[PDB]
Amino acid sequence: PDRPAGIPDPAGTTVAGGGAVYTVVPHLSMPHWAAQDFAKSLQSFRLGCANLKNRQGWQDVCAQAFQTPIHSFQAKRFFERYFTPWQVAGNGSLAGTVTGYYEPVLKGDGRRTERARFPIYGIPDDFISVPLPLVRIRQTGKNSGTHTADLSRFPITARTTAIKGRFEGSRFLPYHTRNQINGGALDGKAPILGYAEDPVELFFMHIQGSGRLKTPSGKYIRIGYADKNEHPYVSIGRYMADKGYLKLGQTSMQGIKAYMRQNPQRLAEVLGQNPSYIFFRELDGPVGALGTPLMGEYAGAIDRHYITLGAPLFVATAHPVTRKALNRLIMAQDTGSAIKGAVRVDYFWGYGDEAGELAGKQKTTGYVWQLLPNGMKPEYRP
């Protein structure tokens, strides 16, 4: 028994906030709307609904998504009948920026072998996260928070949700940095999820926040983001360029990997420049900001000041290699620290080497339309 659709704001309806303006337009104002693989967009929406279904105003669309066949004919009618498109302008411009991201595959093992020597660590035994409002700390769980803490020492910026540290003496000190962990500071006090063959490839898994080990027999060990040490991110590519070990055109993962194989005397130095370090957990698609697994080519990262999390999002852009028209109904199910603005999408390409090529080549103008359940308005969320 089909859910009711509810009443759309009529064409030309506007909402404004934050320099952004949202305008209701017809579905057929989206380029190549007719020719979409709406079965794939429906799959992607259904994945987000495991959590999105619980958010006020999304219950009916999420329920109805599961009573809709996985076929583009029916799935098109679902998106037409239940959602209204809101064309997005940021600061007077429909035009914005599309970049690309992906889930890396790297050679490795569940064990230390001759080939696979670089441990992937989970949350350490002494890693304690404390929420942020010369202070006092009390432990409230084996990895969360009797000891004094020196807040001037911890890496707080204008943005810090929590501090990460460990008890030592009668102190709470910042947790270990990448250079220290590289140097063996976690020996004996952190779970190891597996081993990578290449340390630069591992370094870049940290940069994407998730990955997959491909064992010598072709199996996958799936590795997801769990936490981090909250020390600042520094680009090693920008470090190498003015050192000047490589030119900032060869600053790709693959160029750093090749430089390092030829130059083992610089490995520790360069990797240690990024004091940020990500801890992982044993787990298709990484889990994004919505808390659900992302579907390759049908999910993206957005700015939540501007885009409602979980929303179908039509992106009109250019394919990062063919430069041909790339028009897609994706789901806005993730966020990034570098993704800001009304019209701004990090396009999730999926897992593996091919997705990697696509992602890095993506830096394009794009146009966006946000689809929301009929009646629900977009909102600037300061």
Side-chain angles (χ1 to χ4, degrees):
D2 287 357
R3 297 278 175 118
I7 302 153
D9 293 300
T13 297
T14 42
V15 164
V21 177
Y22 309 88
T23 306
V24 167
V25 293
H27 300 258
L28 274 167
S29 293
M30 298 173 273
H32 298 174
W33 177 261
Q36 291 306 293
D37 193 341
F38 290 107
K40 279 178 194 49
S41 309
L42 182 61
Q43 284 173 294
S44 188
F45 188 65
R46 279 197 190 184
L47 294 158
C49 285
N51 284 359
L52 219 218
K53 87 178 104 153
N54 294 317
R55 266 207 251 147
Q56 189 43 50
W58 289 92
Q59 304 97 324
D60 277 352
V61 292
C62 281
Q64 191 61 31
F66 276 81
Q67 291 169 172
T68 307
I70 308 282
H71 194 286
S72 298
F73 181 75
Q74 284 88 180
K76 182 170 140 209
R77 281 133 93 91
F78 171 70
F79 291 113
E80 288 178 345
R81 276 161 190 210
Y82 286 89
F83 302 74
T84 295
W86 296 79
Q87 183 169 47
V88 182
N91 300 310
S93 181
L94 287 176
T97 298
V98 185
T99 49
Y101 69 118
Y102 84 112
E103 183 185 10
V105 174
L106 41 156
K107 296 174 170 192
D109 225 324
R111 266 176 317 129
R112 196 196 178 205
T113 62
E114 186 182 281
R115 272 212 189 273
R117 297 131 58 206
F118 300 87
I120 288 59
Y121 299 101
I123 295 157
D125 300 352
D126 65 328
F127 181 91
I128 279 96
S129 182
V130 187
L132 202 283
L134 209 92
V135 296
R136 162 82 79 245
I137 260 81
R138 171 156 70 73
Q139 202 205 21
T140 64
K142 43 263 163 181
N143 279 133
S144 62
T146 189
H147 286 77
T148 69
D150 196 34
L151 288 184
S152 49
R153 297 271 173 151
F154 293 76
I156 296 108
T157 335
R159 207 272 149 179
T160 293
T161 190
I163 58 152
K164 323 285 175 165
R166 53 170 201 98
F167 306 116
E168 174 79 37
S170 78
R171 292 187 166 206
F172 199 80
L173 321 157
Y175 207 73
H176 298 289
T177 54
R178 181 175 293 275
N179 180 235
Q180 296 175 314
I181 298 162
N182 282 174
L186 298 183
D187 282 349
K189 64 171 200 186
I192 294 146
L193 314 177
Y195 291 80
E197 283 187 23
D198 185 84
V200 175
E201 291 189 60
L202 220 209
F203 181 94
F204 276 85
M205 192 176 86
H206 277 62
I207 302 167
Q208 299 280 356
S210 59
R212 221 178 278 205
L213 301 176
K214 179 146 189 142
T215 74
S217 57
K219 272 88 170 178
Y220 291 121
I221 292 161
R222 310 203 55 244
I223 303 303
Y225 178 87
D227 213 335
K228 58 179 163 180
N229 62 357
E230 290 287 344
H231 290 278
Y233 162 80
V234 172
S235 185
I236 61 158
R238 290 187 216 107
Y239 174 80
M240 286 176 82
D242 59 69
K243 264 294 168 149
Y245 307 136
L246 282 180
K247 301 200 169 186
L248 196 89
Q250 328 167 224
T251 256
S252 344
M253 194 249 96
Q254 314 84 44
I256 298 168
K257 179 186 177 171
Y259 176 93
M260 236 37 90
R261 219 76 103 174
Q262 300 296 125
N263 291 279
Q265 87 282 355
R266 298 265 170 231
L267 212 223
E269 178 200 326
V270 167
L271 265 43
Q273 298 303 313
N274 180 211
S276 178
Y277 203 89
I278 284 85
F279 303 103
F280 294 98
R281 57 181 207 238
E282 350 61 41
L283 301 167
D284 248 14
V287 165
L290 182 48
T292 59
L294 308 173
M295 185 187 163
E297 285 177 68
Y298 286 93
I302 45 73
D303 176 359
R304 285 185 78 175
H305 287 312
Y306 294 109
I307 308 308
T308 302
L309 190 68
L313 209 260
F314 199 95
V315 182
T317 185
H319 192 284
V321 314
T322 71
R323 281 288 155 254
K324 289 174 190 170
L326 208 232
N327 307 315
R328 289 263 162 94
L329 185 61
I330 72 159
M331 308 293 130
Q333 292 174 342
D334 204 14
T335 57
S337 61
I339 307 295
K340 297 296 183 204
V343 192
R344 187 66 186 93
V345 182
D346 213 17
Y347 186 91
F348 181 63
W349 279 105
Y351 98 82
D353 286 358
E354 293 70 18
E357 284 143 35
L358 293 160
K361 288 204 197 193
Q362 187 130 64
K363 16 93 188 186
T364 57
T365 300
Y367 300 100
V368 311
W369 293 252
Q370 180 173 207
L371 284 61
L372 294 168
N374 300 330
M376 177 196 293
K377 285 202 255 289
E379 181 186 348
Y380 169 60
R381 294 189 176 92

